[PDB]
Amino acid sequence: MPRVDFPRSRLRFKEKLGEGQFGEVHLCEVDSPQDLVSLDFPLGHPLLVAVKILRPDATKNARNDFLKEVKIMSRLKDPNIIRLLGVCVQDDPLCMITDYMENGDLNQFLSAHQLEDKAAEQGPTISYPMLLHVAAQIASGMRYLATLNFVHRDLATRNCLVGENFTIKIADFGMSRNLYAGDYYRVQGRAVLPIRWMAWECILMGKFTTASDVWAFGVTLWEVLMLCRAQPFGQLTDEQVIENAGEFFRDQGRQVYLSRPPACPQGLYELMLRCWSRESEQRPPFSQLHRFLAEDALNT
Amino acid sequence: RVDFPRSRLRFKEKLGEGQFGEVHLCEVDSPQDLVSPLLVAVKILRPDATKNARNDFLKEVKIMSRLKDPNIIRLLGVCVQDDPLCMITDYMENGDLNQFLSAHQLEDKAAGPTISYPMLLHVAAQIASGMRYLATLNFVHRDLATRNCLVGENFTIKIADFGMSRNLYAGDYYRVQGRAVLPIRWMAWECILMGKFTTASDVWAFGVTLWEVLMLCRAQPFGQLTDEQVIENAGEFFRDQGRQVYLSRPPACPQGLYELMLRCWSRESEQRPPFSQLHRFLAED
Ligand SMILES: CC(C)c1ccc(C(=O)Nc2cc(CN3CCN(C)CC3)cc(C(F)(F)F)c2)cc1C#Cc1cnc2cnccn12
Numbered sequence: 001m002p003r004v005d006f007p008r009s010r011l012r013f014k015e016k017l018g019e020g021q022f023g024e025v026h027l028c029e030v031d032s033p034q035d036l037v038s039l040d041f042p043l044g045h046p047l048l049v050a051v052k053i054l055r056p057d058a059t060k061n062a063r064n065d066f067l068k069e070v071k072i073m074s075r076l077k078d079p080n081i082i083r084l085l086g087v088c089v090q091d092d093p094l095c096m097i098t099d100y101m102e103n104g105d106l107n108q109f110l111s112a113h114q115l116e117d118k119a120a121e122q123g124p125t126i127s128y129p130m131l132l133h134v135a136a137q138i139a140s141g142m143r144y145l146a147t148l149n150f151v152h153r154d155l156a157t158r159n160c161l162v163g164e165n166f167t168i169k170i171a172d173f174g175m176s177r178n179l180y181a182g183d184y185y186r187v188q189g190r191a192v193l194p195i196r197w198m199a200w201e202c203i204l205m206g207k208f209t210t211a212s213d214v215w216a217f218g219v220t221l222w223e224v225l226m227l228c229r230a231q232p233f234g235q236l237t238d239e240q241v242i243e244n245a246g247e248f249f250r251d252q253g254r255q256v257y258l259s260r261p262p263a264c265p266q267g268l269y270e271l272m273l274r275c276w277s278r279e280s281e282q283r284p285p286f287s288q289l290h291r292f293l294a295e296d297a298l299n300t
Numbered sequence: 301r302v303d304f305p306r307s308r309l310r311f312k313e314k315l316g317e318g319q320f321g322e323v324h325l326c327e328v329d330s331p332q333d334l335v336s337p338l339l340v341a342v343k344i345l346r347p348d349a350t351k352n353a354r355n356d357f358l359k360e361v362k363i364m365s366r367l368k369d370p371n372i373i374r375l376l377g378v379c380v381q382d383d384p385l386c387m388i389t390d391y392m393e394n395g396d397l398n399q400f401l402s403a404h405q406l407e408d409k410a411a412g413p414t415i416s417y418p419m420l421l422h423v424a425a426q427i428a429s430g431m432r433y434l435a436t437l438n439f440v441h442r443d444l445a446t447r448n449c450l451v452g453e454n455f456t457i458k459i460a461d462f463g464m465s466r467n468l469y470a471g472d473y474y475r476v477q478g479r480a481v482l483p484i485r486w487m488a489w490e491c492i493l494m495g496k497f498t499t500a501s502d503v504w505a506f507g508v509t510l511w512e513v514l515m516l517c518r519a520q521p522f523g524q525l526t527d528e529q530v531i532e533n534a535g536e537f538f539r540d541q542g543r544q545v546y547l548s549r550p551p552a553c554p555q556g557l558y559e560l561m562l563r564c565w566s567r568e569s570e571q572r573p574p575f576s577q578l579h580r581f582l583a584e585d
C-alpha cells in the first residue's frame with residue numbers, strides 16, 4: 001500500500017454519526033473522487049464516505065490498534081466487503097475512510113421491515129426473494145474472504161451494512177457499540193465472544209476456521225429470515241448456549257438447534273442445518289452457499 | 301443426568317391431543333421413593349414426530365429446567381433416554397386462571413361458586429411475585445395472560461406458557477408471519493409496532509392480566525375492537541396525539557387499582573412500575 005495520506009481538505013463534513021472513547025465517526029462528502037479512489041462508482045454527485053477520526057491525544061495502544069485495523073482492511077477489495085478508501089496517518093488526528101452504506105447495519109434495517117403478505121394484499125415491507133438476495137450477497141462476500149484464507153470470526157447481521165438497492169457489505173465494528181452488548185459473552189478481561197453465532201468447536205476449543213464462519217453464516221441467515229426480531233437462542237442463557245456446544249461434542253442427541261423461522265421453506269432450513277453440521281468438513285463451502293442462494297433468489 | 305422412571309407414571313386421563321403428541325394426567329406410583337398421592341402433568345411426544353418437533357421439545361426442557369419459584373410452573377423430570385420423549389411438571393387441579401375465574405362470580409356478602417375481592421388481589425399478587433422472579437432471571441415471558449396462569453389448591457397461582465397448542469384461545473392471537481402469532485391485546489404499543497419485548501412490556505401485559513382478573517375473565521380486552529383497530533391503537537400511542545384508548549375500569553374496581561393499571565400502560569417503558577412494586581402494592585397497599 002502506498003504511504004500517501006488521503007487529503008483531509010477533500011473531506012467536507014456533513015454529520016457526526018457517532019462518538020466514542022477514543023474519537024468520533026463522521027459522514028463526509030468527496031467531490032469528483034475519481035482522482036483519489038478506484039471504485040465501481042454508484043449513481044455527478046459527491047461520494048459519501050464514513051470517517052473514523054482517532055482522538056488527537058490517543059494512547060500509543062489505541063494508535064497501534066488503529067494501524068493494525070488499517071492493515072487488515074487494506075487487503076479487502078470486493079463488492080460485498082466494506083472498502084478502505086484511504087487514511088490520514090502522517091499527522092494527527094489519525095483518520096480512516098470507508099465507503100458509506102446509507103441504511104446502516106443489516107440488523108436495524110430488517111428490524112424496521114416486515115415480510116410482505118401475499119394473502120393480505122403500514123410500515124416498509126421486504127419480499128422473500130429480496131431476503132434471499134441479501135443472504136446471497138453475504139455468502140458472496142464470505143466466499144471472497146475464504147479465498148484470502150481470511151476468517152472473519154464475528155459474522156452476524158449487526159456486522160453487515162446496507163446501501164442503496166439492498167447492496168450488502170460485510171464489516172466488523174468490534175465492541176464499539178453498546179447496542180449489541182447482549183450478543184457477546186466475556187471470557188477473559190476485555191475479550192468477549194459472540195457465542196450464539198459460534199460453532200461448538202469455537203466455544204469449547206477456540207478453533208476459528210472458515211468452516212466456523214459457515215456456522216456463523218447459518219445463524220446469520222437464520223437472523224435474516226427472522227427479520228432480526230429475536231436473538232439466537234434468546235430464551236437460553238449464555239451458560240446454556242455454552243452447555244449446548246458441549247452437547248454437540250458429546251453427540252448423544254441432546255444438542256439443540258435454532259428452530260425453522262416462520263415462513264422459512266424447508267429447503268432453506270435444511271441449508272442452515274448443513275451449516276451446523278457437527279463435523280466442520282461436512283459444512284458447505286461459501287461458494288456452494290452463494291450458488292444455492294443466488295439461484296434460489298431468482299427462482300422465488 | 302438420569303431420566304425419570306417411565307413405569308411410575310400411571311395413566312389417569314388424557315388432558316389433550318396435539319399435532320405432535322399428547323398430554324396426560326398421571327399419578328406417580330410411589331412418590332416417597334423418588335422424593336430424594338402426587339399428581340403430575342406429562343407431555344408425550346409422538347414416537348413418529350419429526351426431528352424438528354423433537355428439537356423444539358428439548359429446547360422447552362432447557363428453558364423450563366431453570367425455572368424454580370413457588371409461582372412458576374416447575375419441571376419435575378424428563379424421559380429422554382428413549383422414545384417417546386416425556387416432560388413432567390406439577391399438576392394444578394383447577395385448570396388455567398381464565399377457566400377458573402370464568403366459572404366464578406364476585407362475592408357480595410350484602411346479597412355458583414364465588415371469590416372475594418381480597419382473594420382476587422391475592423391471585424394478582426401471586427402473578428406479580430412470579431413475574432418478579434422471571435425478571436431477576438432476565439427472562440421475558442412475552443405471553444402473560446390469565447390463559448397462561450394455572451390454579452392449584454388454596455388459590456395458588458403458577459405462571460406457565462402453553463404456546464398456541466390450544467384452540468380455546470385462538471382469538472387472543474394475531475398472525476404476523478407464517479405460524480408466528482402475537483397476543484396483541486396484551487402487548488405494549490412498542491411490541492406491536494417494533495417488536496421490542498422487555499420486562500417493561502411484560503408489565504404492560506400484567507396490567508391487562510390484572511384487568512382480566514378484576515373482570516373475572518368475562519370479556520376479551522378491547523373485545524368490540526378488531527385486531528386491526530388494536531394495532532392502529534398502538535400507532536396512536538406512538539403518535540401521542542391524545543387519540544390512544546385504554547381499557548376501561550372494571551366494574552367495582554377501585555380507582556386506585558385502576559390507576560395502577562394505567563401506570564403499567566405508560567407510553568414510556570421506563571415509566572412503568574417494576575414487578576416488585578406491583579407485588580407489594582397488591583399484597584399489602
Ligand atoms: C467508521 C468507519 C471509518 C469504519 C471503520 C472500520 C470499519 C470496519 O468494518 N473495519 C474492519 C476491521 C477488521 C479487523 N478487525 C476487526 C475487529 N478488531 C477489533 C480489529 C480489526 C475486519 C473487517 C472486515 F470485516 F472487513 F474483515 C473490517 C467499518 C467502518 C464503517 C462504516 C459505515 C458505512 N456506512 C455506515 C453507516 N452507519 C454506520 C457506519 N457505516
Ligand SMILES: CC(C)c1ccc(C(=O)Nc2cc(CN3CCN(C)CC3)cc(C(F)(F)F)c2)cc1C#Cc1cnc2cnccn12
Pocket residue numbers: 315323341342343359360363364367372373387388389390391392393394395396441450459460461462463
Ligand atoms: C403438559 C405439561 C408437561 C406442561 C409442559 C410445559 C408447560 C409450560 O408452561 N412450559 C413453558 C415453556 C416456556 C418456553 N416456551 C418455549 C417456546 N414456546 C414457544 C413457548 C414457551 C416458558 C414457560 C414459562 F412460562 F414458565 F416461562 C413455560 C406446562 C405444562 C403443564 C401443565 C398443567 C398443570 N396443571 C394443568 C392442568 N390442566 C392442563 C394442564 N396443566
